[PDB]
Amino acid sequence: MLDPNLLRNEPDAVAEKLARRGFKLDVDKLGALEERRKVLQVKTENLQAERNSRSKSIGQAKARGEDIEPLRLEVNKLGEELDAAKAELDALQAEIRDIALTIPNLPADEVPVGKDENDNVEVSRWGTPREFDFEVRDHVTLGEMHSGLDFAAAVKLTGSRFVVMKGQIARMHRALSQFMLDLHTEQHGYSENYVPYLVNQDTLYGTGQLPKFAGDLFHTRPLEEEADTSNYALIPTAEVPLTNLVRGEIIDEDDLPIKMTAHTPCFRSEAGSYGRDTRGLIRMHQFDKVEMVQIVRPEDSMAALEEMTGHAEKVLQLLGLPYRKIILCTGDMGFGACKTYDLEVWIPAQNTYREISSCSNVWDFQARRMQARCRSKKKTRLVHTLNGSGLAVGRTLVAVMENYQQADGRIEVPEVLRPYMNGLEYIG
Amino acid sequence: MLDPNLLRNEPDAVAEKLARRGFKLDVDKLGALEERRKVLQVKTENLQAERNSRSKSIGQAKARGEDIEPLRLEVNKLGEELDAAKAELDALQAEIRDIALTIPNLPADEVPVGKDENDNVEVSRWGTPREFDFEVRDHVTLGEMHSGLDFAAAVKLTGSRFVVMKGQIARMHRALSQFMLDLHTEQHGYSENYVPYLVNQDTLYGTGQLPKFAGDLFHTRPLEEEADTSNYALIPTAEVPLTNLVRGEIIDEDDLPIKMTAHTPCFRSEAGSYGRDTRGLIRMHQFDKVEMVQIVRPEDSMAALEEMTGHAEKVLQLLGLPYRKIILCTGDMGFGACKTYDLEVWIPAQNTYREISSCSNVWDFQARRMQARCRSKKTRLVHTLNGSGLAVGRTLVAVMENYQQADGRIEVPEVLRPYMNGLEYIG
Numbered sequence: 001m002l003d004p005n006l007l008r009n010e011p012d013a014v015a016e017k018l019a020r021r022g023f024k025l026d027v028d029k030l031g032a033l034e035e036r037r038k039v040l041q042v043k044t045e046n047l048q049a050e051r052n053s054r055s056k057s058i059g060q061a062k063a064r065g066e067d068i069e070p071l072r073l074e075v076n077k078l079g080e081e082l083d084a085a086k087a088e089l090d091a092l093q094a095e096i097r098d099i100a101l102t103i104p105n106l107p108a109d110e111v112p113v114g115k116d117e118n119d120n121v122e123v124s125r126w127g128t129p130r131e132f133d134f135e136v137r138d139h140v141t142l143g144e145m146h147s148g149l150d151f152a153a154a155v156k157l158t159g160s161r162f163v164v165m166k167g168q169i170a171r172m173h174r175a176l177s178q179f180m181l182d183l184h185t186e187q188h189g190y191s192e193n194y195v196p197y198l199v200n201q202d203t204l205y206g207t208g209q210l211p212k213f214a215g216d217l218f219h220t221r222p223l224e225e226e227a228d229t230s231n232y233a234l235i236p237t238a239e240v241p242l243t244n245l246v247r248g249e250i251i252d253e254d255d256l257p258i259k260m261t262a263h264t265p266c267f268r269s270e271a272g273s274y275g276r277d278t279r280g281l282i283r284m285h286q287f288d289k290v291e292m293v294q295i296v297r298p299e300d301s302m303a304a305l306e307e308m309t310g311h312a313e314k315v316l317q318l319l320g321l322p323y324r325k326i327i328l329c330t331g332d333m334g335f336g337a338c339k340t341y342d343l344e345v346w347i348p349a350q351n352t353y354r355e356i357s358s359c360s361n362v363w364d365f366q367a368r369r370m371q372a373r374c375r376s377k378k379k380t381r382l383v384h385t386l387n388g389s390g391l392a393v394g395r396t397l398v399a400v401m402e403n404y405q406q407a408d409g410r411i412e413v414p415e416v417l418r419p420y421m422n423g424l425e426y427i428g
Numbered sequence: 429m430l431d432p433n434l435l436r437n438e439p440d441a442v443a444e445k446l447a448r449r450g451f452k453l454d455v456d457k458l459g460a461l462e463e464r465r466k467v468l469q470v471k472t473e474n475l476q477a478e479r480n481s482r483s484k485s486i487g488q489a490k491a492r493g494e495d496i497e498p499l500r501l502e503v504n505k506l507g508e509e510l511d512a513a514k515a516e517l518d519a520l521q522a523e524i525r526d527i528a529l530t531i532p533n534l535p536a537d538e539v540p541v542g543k544d545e546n547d548n549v550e551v552s553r554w555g556t557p558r559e560f561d562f563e564v565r566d567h568v569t570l571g572e573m574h575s576g577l578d579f580a581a582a583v584k585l586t587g588s589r590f591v592v593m594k595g596q597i598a599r600m601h602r603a604l605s606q607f608m609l610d611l612h613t614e615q616h617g618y619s620e621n622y623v624p625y626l627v628n629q630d631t632l633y634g635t636g637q638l639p640k641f642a643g644d645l646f647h648t649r650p651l652e653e654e655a656d657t658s659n660y661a662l663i664p665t666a667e668v669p670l671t672n673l674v675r676g677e678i679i680d681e682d683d684l685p686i687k688m689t690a691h692t693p694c695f696r697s698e699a700g701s702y703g704r705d706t707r708g709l710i711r712m713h714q715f716d717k718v719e720m721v722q723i724v725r726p727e728d729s730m731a732a733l734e735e736m737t738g739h740a741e742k743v744l745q746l747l748g749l750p751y752r753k754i755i756l757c758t759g760d761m762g763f764g765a766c767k768t769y770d771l772e773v774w775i776p777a778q779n780t781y782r783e784i785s786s787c788s789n790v791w792d793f794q795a796r797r798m799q800a801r802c803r804s805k806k807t808r809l810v811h812t813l814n815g816s817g818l819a820v821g822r823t824l825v826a827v828m829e830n831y832q833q834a835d836g837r838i839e840v841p842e843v844l845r846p847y848m849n850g851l852e853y854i855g
């Protein structure tokens with residue numbers, strides 16, 4: 001959610017910034033509801049003052065031995081008028097909240113204006129894509145050769161967009177997640193967390209999956225013994241449970257930043273992807289990801305974005321994987337982001353770079369939904385939140401398999417993963 | 429599923445064995461359906477002979493120049509009767525299979541007869557429970573002290589019977605999983621697998637979760653774009669996807685045994701657990717577990733059960749955790765097992781042992797459902813086995829409580845220190 005004061009005091013300036021994202025805010029519809037809400041708030045306050053005064057008059061008339069029936073009739077009338085005005089105000093506030101919950105975040109001023117991915121801007125590059133002296137194989141072919149990636153088995157067990165990994169390739173996928181968690185928790189200052197992989201509706205509203213993106217998730221049916229409290233969804237990223245750990249809290253500013261990481265499976269319906277990324281591990285219903293989340297004071301979020309993006313870049317550099325860093329344009333950003341960097345890793349068989357991390361500054365947008373606040377050394381204000389992949393493990397495995405392949409199909413194990421793979425030098 | 433030959437031709441002998449595990453086979457109902465099936469099979473044969481004979485008569489009457497119209501109508505009526513016979517036979521065969529899928533496995537002869545968990549038999553015990561010179565703290569209190577187990581945060585994110593682990597305790601939980609996978613893959617001969625955590629209905633029938641235990645699982649709603657193919661359930665154990673990897677296969681016996689391991693989250697509704705293990709990590713909707721699965725030739729499954737149970741015992745021994753090995757009696761075994769060992773670990777704050785692994789020989793029960801066979805020639809069903817090596821959450825409970833110090837710090841078990849960047853103590 002955006003600051004309601006920006007929506008009430010600068011609705012036209014807010015609408016203009018939102019148009020850059022391709023979002024059309026109906027200023028006049030919201031303004032008419034806000035005007036009706038102000039009228040109803042004044043009415044409820046007037047009715048409450050009038051009812052309270054008439055109640056004091058009853059006490060006095062009763063003590064004076066006067067007839068209290070005319071006053072009792074008035075107090076009853078006023079109580080019902082107050083109940084009607086409160087019901088109308090609650091319905092109006094709900095209508096306003098429903099609109100407010102559909103609005104994407106305001107982009108930061110330095111975000112370039114653009115309509116889609118072609119308008120994103122490269123800000124830096126690292127490393128040189130390997131020049132091969134043989135015909136490269138993609139990760140699916142490499143995984144078949146080593147009996148390490150089995151998509152057919154996953155279709156039998158479950159369905160499309162799942163995988164079964166086996167043996168040395170499964171060990172390498174595990175080693176990547178362990179190297180990532182260790183780097184972030186031993187060198188980058190994040191605290192490790194084990195989280196639920198199912199979450200409730202309050203959590204989904206907190207991070208912005210709800211109300212607009214229910215279709216992007218897998219939902220579980222309620223349990224018979226928890227009939228009214230188990231409408232859950234599988235997490236699409238650890239950003240959702242981690243960010244919500246501060247929901248409803250007031251944190252002392254001196255206890256910020258809070259830096260968290262977790263390795264979890266991530267579940268996505270991938271709706272709207274018919275025929276998109278049908279090869280291999282690129283777009284799965286289930287993928288592992290090592291996530292970074294930061295909860296910071298509002299003054300420090302742009303600085304924290306650079307730090308967190310650097311933490312993701314360090315994973316790629318230590319793995320020897322060439323990449324490019326892109327700033328997303330206004331039209332290509334996620335709902336809650338105000339500024340995002342994507343890291344795109346070189347994928348030899350595709351002869352292009354593919355997204356391996358998104359790092360975003362969410363400003364106070366999720367903090368507002370979650371009422372996550374901070375207190376200065378005594379008035380409170382919303383914190384800022386940030387999230388970033390460090391990294392998507394499946395896509396990192398694709399990049400390692402393809403960039404480290406040898407002419408005979410073996411895959412050299414990157415130096416940093418060897419201590420996690422019992423010293424193994426090559427797959428195959 | 430049981431061998432259909434045994435159910436059809438020695439139902440009372442099968443009933444005698446099933447009654448020892450507390451299951452009453454309805455021999456009368458099954459026998460009545462089987463007789464209707466055999467009668468319909470004969471009726472179909474009578475009808476087909478009549479249809480072929482009347483069709484042969486048409487050809488003769490056509491060559492002679494006689495009126496073939498009455499014989500043509502007779503052939504059509506016989507075709508309709510054959511159609512009805514076949515539909516009734518298919519419906520009956522489905523009804524018989526539906527019943528067959530509700531029957532538990534036959535217990536092995538050496539399984540002690542008993543009614544419930546009080547009739548289980550202790551086989552062996554290892555180690556000696558620690559004697560404490562201070563008041564024992566439970567894992568929940570220890571987890572609060574170190575800001576490492578946060579159940580209230582999990583209620584806020586999700587609901588009851590979930591947890592959020594943080595910091596050193598979360599790292600210890602991870603180290604346990606890594607130590608277990610490395611032991612099984614590097615010393616015990618298991619192949620590591622990454623598996624789906626959602627599975628389809630065929631997979632659930634393959635391992636026995638369906639038809640009877642749908643209420644034990646979390647089910648996902650179908651996806652709008654996979655409307656007829658995405659009725660999935662979250663896995664309750666990696667046994668489900670791993671064992672189904674051999675579904676529909678004919679394996680050369682020289683390629684057996686197949687030994688697989690995986691580390692996965694496990695999801696369970698825990699229906700019927702009102703007020704049982706309300707506090708802590710012992711009974712959760714989500715828990716991690718390092719699973720072992722073996723696919724073996726039928727002659728080797730009892731030896732494989734001893735080997736696999738020993739693999740799970742080695743995790744406890746290496747972690748210095750006292751335990752007991754129990755053989756479950758007939759009345760306390762799970763649906764698909766023919767023989768199960770319960771490894772139970774010492775839990776200081778509860779002053780008792782709690783199950784940390786179940787190791788089972790499933791005989792040919794899942795192999796039959798999955799049509800997983802092997803060739804030595806003729807084919808036969810493989811045997812399947814599964815065993816926890818171990819449930820990670822309960823192992824964490826056991827490590828936290830058994831290694832606690834007077835001041836609330838927790839000594840890190842020696843074997844986990846290389847997986848915890850050399851950390852000696854939690855705190």
Ligand SMILES: Nc1ncnc2c1ncn2[C@@H]1O[C@H](COS(=O)(=O)NC(=O)[C@@H](N)CO)[C@@H](O)[C@H]1O
Nearest residue numbers: 237239282283284287355356357358388389392
């Ligand atoms: N369906 C998918 N299959 C495989 N990898 C995926 C899939 N969807 C996303 N990813 C990977 O996960 C990364 C992060 O996903 S994201 O949606 O862009 N961003 C987030 O989820 C944020 N919480 C930051 O991690 C992507 O950059 C991509 O590498």
Ligand SMILES: Nc1ncnc2c1ncn2[C@@H]1O[C@H](COS(=O)(=O)NC(=O)[C@@H](N)CO)[C@@H](O)[C@H]1O
Nearest residue numbers: 665667710711712715783784785786815816819
């Ligand atoms: N809800 C739960 N929460 C935590 N741990 C559990 C839960 N249910 C079972 N476990 C643990 O998981 C172990 C194995 O579970 S089991 O159902 O007994 N058996 C299996 O699942 C078999 N596939 C062997 O692993 C149990 O011994 C127990 O230690």
